Amino acid sequence: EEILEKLRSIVSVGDPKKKYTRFKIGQGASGTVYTAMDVATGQEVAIKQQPKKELIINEILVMRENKNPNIVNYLDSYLELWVVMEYLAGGSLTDVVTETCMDEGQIAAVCRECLQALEFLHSNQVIHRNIKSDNILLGMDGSVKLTDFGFCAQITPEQSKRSTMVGTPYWMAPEVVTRKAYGPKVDIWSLGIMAIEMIEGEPPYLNENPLRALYLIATNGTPELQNPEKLSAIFRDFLNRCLEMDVEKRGSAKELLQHQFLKIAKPLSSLTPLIAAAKEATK
């Protein structure tokens, strides 16, 4: 594995115990996450800490070469990995969508910020491929930022398509599920599933097993709203252009950013009551 000396090349010297001090907020299997504070300017930071480390390289590379206000900023890296990124204290969007009710103004605000991140990434030939509420972090000010870039596909005019099944089943686009040639608009499909999260609390088929869900997406196509009557006609229009089977007819991030639905978006400060509610429900 000479891929390991490629990772040693990217990282910073050290020592890490001299810039950010120290302080265990959340943890999955793909590493664990912590918190800290910069000694210099007084900035507060988050730090994530075998199998398949090539994803890690891809995550660090893509991150530091695609900086954007709607993307969780990469900062530093040391030696497991000591990936340092900015700290968003509001937490994940998963907590908000599963524990609170969001009105269409709040949903619109989030969709807009996410579309801004996707319009930026796609214009830099990067497909995220794992959009879901779990990879949306919230600031205490209501900022909305995209994270988790390990499954990013870097495309180019010579190979602007992929056909591998990557992502998370409930959020994957039909073309990805059926191993067809797909592009950036798969992120738009995943965004649409995330919008359904924000409405109904979870993606379609979440009560089914991953394979059954995978099978259902492959055969059903566009998912159904339980109560489509609760939504406005312009929100439903927005949804149907995210979740179009015809990739040619599905909306890109650029053209979706101009949809009439995003016009009723509330200020991001309207999200802070959702955050406070999520945290109360979480405790």
Ligand SMILES: N[C@H]1CC[C@H](CNc2nccc(Nc3cc(C4CC4)n[nH]3)n2)CC1
């Ligand atoms: N799929 C995602 C699931 C949640 C995981 C971290 N959990 C968490 N919990 C509370 C606050 C917070 N904030 C936070 C993290 C981070 C960096 C690490 C990315 N910045 N801000 N992050 C990240 C991966």
